[PDB]
Amino acid sequence: NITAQDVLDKIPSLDLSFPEGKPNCLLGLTIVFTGVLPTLERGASEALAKRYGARVTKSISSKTSVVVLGDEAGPKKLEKIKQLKIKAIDEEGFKQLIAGMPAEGGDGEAAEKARRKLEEQHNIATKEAELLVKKEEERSKKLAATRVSVVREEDKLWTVKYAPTNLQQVCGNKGSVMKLKNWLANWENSKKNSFKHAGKDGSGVFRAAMLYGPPGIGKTTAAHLVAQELGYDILEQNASDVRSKTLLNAGVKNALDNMSVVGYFKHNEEAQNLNGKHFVIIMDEVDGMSGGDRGGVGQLAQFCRKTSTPLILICNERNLPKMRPFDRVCLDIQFRRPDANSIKSRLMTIAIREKFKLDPNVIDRLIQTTRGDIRQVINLLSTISTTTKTINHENINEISKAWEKNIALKPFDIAHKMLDGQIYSDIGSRNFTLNDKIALYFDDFDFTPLMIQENYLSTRPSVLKPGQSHLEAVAEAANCISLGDIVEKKIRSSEQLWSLLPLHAVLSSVYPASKVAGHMAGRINFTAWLGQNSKSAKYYRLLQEIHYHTRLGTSTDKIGLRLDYLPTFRKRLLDPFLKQGADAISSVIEVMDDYYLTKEDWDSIMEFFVGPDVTTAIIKKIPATVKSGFTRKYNSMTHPVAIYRT
Amino acid sequence: TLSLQLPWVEKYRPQVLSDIVGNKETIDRLQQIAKDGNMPHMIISGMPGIGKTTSVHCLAHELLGRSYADGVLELNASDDRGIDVVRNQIKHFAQKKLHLPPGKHKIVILDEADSMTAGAQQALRRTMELYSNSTRFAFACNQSNKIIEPLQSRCAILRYSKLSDEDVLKRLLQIIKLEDVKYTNDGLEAIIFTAEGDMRQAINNLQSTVAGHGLVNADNVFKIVDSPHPLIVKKMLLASNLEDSIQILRTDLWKKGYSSIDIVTTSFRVTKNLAQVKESVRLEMIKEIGLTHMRILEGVGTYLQLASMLAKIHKLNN
DNA sequence: CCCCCCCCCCTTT
DNA sequence: AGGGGGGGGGG
DNA sequence: GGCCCCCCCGGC
DNA sequence: TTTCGGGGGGGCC
Ligand SMILES: Nc1ncnc2c1ncn2[C@@H]1O[C@H](COP(=O)(O)OP(=O)(O)OP(O)(O)=S)[C@@H](O)[C@H]1O
Ligand SMILES: Nc1ncnc2c1ncn2[C@@H]1O[C@H](COP(=O)(O)OP(=O)(O)OP(O)(O)=S)[C@@H](O)[C@H]1O
Ligand SMILES: [Mg+2]
Ligand SMILES: [Mg+2]
């Protein structure tokens, strides 16, 4: 009847309140939103697009159908649009488009394929609901039969009622679950080979597993289901148990190489169920091991390499320093946030069983509200369905705003957000306020100033005042950074003036960024001050050692020793080896004896010079025989000691 | 003379969910949950004097009836709530066996859960899951960010809003009707104005009036009550001329007994949230206020320093 | 087997 | 921001 | 039961 | 990283 391309052709094409349409009128058309729309905000425009089933893509691609363009569009957007020759429209164009598809279909293969996918999802949801009701019916029949000769199904949390029963019912992370199943299904072969026959997947060398991912993605569920499907008997320890070295070495340790009495007394009548007699250890919430569990992490790491039964560790965040001991002793399995297309049918099934209407078009939004948390979205559905019987586009905004998950940002994310020119503009400052910026700083107040100081010279600004240059803004930012450093020194003092922390937030992070806010010109780099400070401390300790090894013969301080004495000591200690060969040894030794210097002190002194006097290459170029003879001569004599019992 | 009267804040603390004003949607959800049952794990967040503890207590009471004394375990900041407590007492309570009506469960109330340490919150994780068929958890906090993400994932979020003037007026009028307190419209308006959405403060000021002077009018309220000094600081920092700002600072703050540190902190906070001034101007003002705050902290806290701060602020805002 | 979107996740003591 | 990785679509 | 020690925050 | 002071949680005894 009506093809989408014809309607698009009718609409005007740009060159380089709204009317109500019909259900799924934009279905099958991919729309990318760029720039600022005078009428609708980015969130409002995205909601209006998703109302009609349109798929919103964050990036422009050859498959894109239309791209609404307004004002303030980035150069990359225009470059991609021109390269891929993608049509663009205006606010009036979008208004006409949303009402120019009365047939909500009858278009190219894209719309038909989208409708087929929607029908397949509906059919899958219906089949799941049918199977669930059949299971309920058989359970009721068994209960009646038992009662003829305990927990009500309507009294359970929805997260327990609809918990996955098999590994095919788990949504998302299919690859990770498959990898875990393969690893646990070939554990016997690896054990028979002593965990040395590394397979193609590489999981044959690891006798332990480390599952990590964000909350509410199906990690504990996946581990338990994998253990159960293979017949293993599950032994579990959670954060509610004191997992310290003292009790860990007296508890679960014995089970690492012992059979299960439960398995033997429960699978005595079964056949081929070898795993029933074995153990599978599951350590849940390893990251939750606080001071109450002393030395537990090290003991778990030791067990990982000396365990005779499969061992699976579960944690939320794997990149903490505290989790370093598990660096290369377990097979790491990452569980990423499931996409909104993985749990869709599950949400239809829950809606059908619970007798409330959940429009599919608003499902995606909910996933962003909880940041891909299945437990949280199920809880949200259960709570909202209590009084609201319809979850549609007329109320999704309120629910999403009232259930937003506030996850503290990390150093890199904080730096990226705070060095963005949008938030510092009038409109951006109106939306993202100064209080929000101070809170973003407080999210990590120990690393935000360092990241800002590290990444405030590698951006192209977009907030430059009229007549100002990039260098002047950089200088102003540096001045405020110095002032913030002074304030920090005052905070960490003998007076503990922590009440000045908010002021520091404005002086160290917010103000300089506002002065150089723009677009990052390169990769965000981690602060380099910590490694440099550690190196400086090490070199200062070495300098102090040299100074107190030579104090008796020298008249100076450590600074004077470094700035003035050391070059002459180089001329007296390193130059001779380069001129007279091995014959220098004696002379050099004498000089060292004249100042109570050792070989370690020799290397430390040689490691101080910088610039044109770097001795690393020269020292490497010294003949090996000369150094060997020097060492032999040094170790073949008796030398004095400047300080006894250092 | 040695016998005390129960304050109105405790004498009229709502005992049924129908008497809690404000947050109509959440209260309706709680009422329907009580009518049906199957209470989930929940976290109630908000600001002081809004009815979070009242809501949780009313829900638990109406849910558990006569079994309140056996199915409710209440712990607050005045009780030890360390890792050992979570791992022993709460675990034993969750594992306890108790007979309750069909759709009722034991309730573990953790008031002011924000103060709880990370270890205890982590330990609660699997306990809330293994025994969810018999026990449910209700956290009440002021700052939701203090509760770890795994715990938030397991519960239902209930963020409370500040009571509007209409709801505060309704509850205040009910209290006046019950106590037969003579009042005037301006007095109630002043009480609401000082309340700032805090029902506890509103009731306390209403009792102080009547207890102090009798008939509730703006005159008596302002005689016993002081207009919030943040508004005075805002007026001082928004004056068109330096003379007016100095006059406000002297007459309304310095001569009233407010300390310099309080004044400078309030000025910082007010300048942070002045949406009618540009961000750059606010940042410069904050820099000046921080300089003055550091000077005051060093020990030099004088009227001259605050006057200099105002002069510099007016220099910037020109 | 090979390639192309679409997004996520990690840099980090 | 830049680079690596996982999964659906085309091929 | 009591010292003694180590680790971790600190604004609103 | 980091200059006191307070709190928790574990280890000797
Ligand atoms: N992939 C999933 N598919 C279906 N339901 C899920 C999924 N993930 C989580 N859920 C639901 O949320 C509940 C809890 O899932 P969990 O396995 O505990 O997630 P988790 O990642 O282990 O949570 P943490 O790490 O302890 S915060 C499940 O019983 C399910 O009801
Ligand atoms: N919605 C309300 N309706 C009627 N009275 C209220 C209401 N909210 C608070 N009050 C009154 O103020 C008193 C204290 O209320 P609370 O429930 O203790 O406030 P709260 O939010 O729990 O305090 P925080 O957050 O721990 S500082 C109640 O006894 C009531 O008398
Ligand atoms: Mg888990
Ligand atoms: Mg309270």
Shortest distance between the Cα of A288 and any Cα of chain B, in A, equals: 5
Query: What tokens were used for A309?
Result: 């039964």
d(CA A484, CA A477): 10
Nucleotides, chain C, CB distance < 7 Å: 4-13
Which amino acid, B51? G
Please name the method used to determine this structure: cryo-EM
Counting beta carbons within 10 angstroms of the beta carbon of residue A642, is it exposed (0 to 12), middle (13 to 18) or buried (19 or more)?
middle
Query: What tokens were used for A410?
Result: 């990390």
Per DSSP, the three-state class of A461 is: strand
Asked whether the CA dihedral A181, A225, A162, A288 is positive or negative, the reply is negative
d(CA A439, CA A108): 49
Q: Is B7 in the pocket of ligand 2 (CB under 6 A)?
A: no
Query: Which residues, including other chains, have CB under 8 Å from residue B202's CB and lie 6 or more apart?
Result: B49, B168, B172, B191, B192, B194, B195
Nucleotides, chain D, CB distance < 7 Å: 1-2, 6-10
Q: Which of B152, B268, B270 to mutate to test the interface with A (most CBs of A within 10 A)?
A: B152
Query: What tokens were used for A165?
Result: 């029963």
Query: Which residues, including other chains, have CB under 8 Å from residue B312's CB and lie 6 or more apart?
Result: B288
Which amino acid, A497? L
Q: Would you say A217 is a known binding-site residue?
A: yes
Q: Which ligand is nearest to the CA of B173?
A: 2
* Other beta carbons within 10 Å of A418: 25
d(CA B73, CA B135): 10
Are the C-beta atoms of residues A203 and A186 closer than 8 Å to each other? yes
d(CA A362, CA A383): 16
Distance B296 CA to ligand 4 centre (A): 35
Question: DSSP per residue over A394-427, as a string?
Answer: TTHHHHHHHT---PPPPHHHHHHHHTBHHHHSHH
d(CA A114, CA A111): 5
Shortest distance between the Cα of A308 and any Cα of chain B, in A, equals: 26
Q: How many contacts does A have with B, using Cβ atoms within 8 A?
A: 143
3-state secondary structure A144-191: HHHHHCCCCHHHCCHHHHCCCCCCCCCCCCHHHHHHHHHHHHCHHHHH
- Among chain B residues, CA nearest to A240: B123
Run of H or E residues at A121? helix A109-148
d(CA B212, CA B309): 39
Contact call for B287 and A506, based on CB within 8 A? yes
CA B54 to C1' C8 (Å) is 43
Closest Cβ opposite residue A403 in set B25, B29, B157: B157
Q: Does A290 touch chain B (CB under 8 A)?
A: yes
Q: Would you say A213 is a known binding-site residue?
A: yes
Query: Which residues, including other chains, have CB under 8 Å from residue A382's CB and lie 6 or more apart?
Result: A157, A158, A354, B40, B156
Are the C-beta atoms of residues A326 and A304 closer than 8 Å to each other? yes
Query: Which residues, including other chains, have CB under 8 Å from residue B244's CB and lie 6 or more apart?
Result: none
Q: Residues of B comprising the binding site for ATP? A: 9, 21, 46-54, 142, 200
d(CA A511, CA A517): 10
What angle do helix axes A434-443 and B260-272 make, rounded to 10 degrees? Answer: 100
Counting beta carbons within 10 angstroms of the beta carbon of residue A260, is it exposed (0 to 12), middle (13 to 18) or buried (19 or more)?
buried
Asked whether the CA dihedral A186, A190, A195, A198 is positive or negative, the reply is negative
Backbone angles phi, psi at A283, to 5 degrees: -100, 100
Query: Which residues, including other chains, have CB under 8 Å from residue A64's CB and lie 6 or more apart?
Result: A30, A31, A32, A57, A84, A86
CA B117 to C1' E7 (Å) is 13
Q: Does A250 touch chain B (CB under 8 A)?
A: no
* Other beta carbons within 10 Å of B60: 21
CA of A416: nearest nucleotide by C1' is D1
Counting beta carbons within 10 angstroms of the beta carbon of residue A428, is it exposed (0 to 12), middle (13 to 18) or buried (19 or more)?
middle
d(CA A219, CA A314): 7
* Other beta carbons within 10 Å of A211: 27
Ligand 1 atom 28: residue of nearest CA = A163
Residues 32-61 of A with CB under 8 A from B: none
Contact call for A510 and B144, based on CB within 8 A? no
Strand F closer than 7 Å to the CB of A450? yes
Could you tell me where the beta strands, DSSP code E, fall in A14-64?
Answer: 30-34, 55-56
* Other beta carbons within 10 Å of A185: 14
According to DSSP, the residues that pair with A313 across neighbouring strands are: A210, A283
Q: Where are the alpha helices (DSSP H) in chain B?
A: 8-11, 24-36, 52-64, 68-71, 83-85, 91-95, 118-130, 149-154, 165-179, 185-195, 199-211, 218-224, 229-237, 242-248, 260-272, 279-298, 303-316
Q: CA-based diameter of chain B, in Å?
A: 73
Q: Does A499 touch chain B (CB under 8 A)?
A: yes
Closest Cβ opposite residue B150 in set A316, A408, A500: A316
Shortest distance between the Cα of A497 and any Cα of chain B, in A, equals: 8
Neighbours of ion ligand 4 (CB under 5 A): B 53
Nucleotides, chain F, CB distance < 7 Å: 1-5, 8-11
Contacts 24+ apart (CB under 8 A), A5-12: A5/A107, A5/A108, A7/A97, A7/A100, A7/A101, A8/A65, A8/A66, A8/A87, A8/A97, A10/A100, A11/A89, A11/A93, A11/A96, A11/A97, A11/A100, A12/A89, A12/A90, A12/A92, A12/A93
Are the C-beta atoms of residues A13 and A120 closer than 8 Å to each other? no
d(CA A479, CA A511): 10
Are the C-beta atoms of residues A454 and A511 closer than 8 Å to each other? no
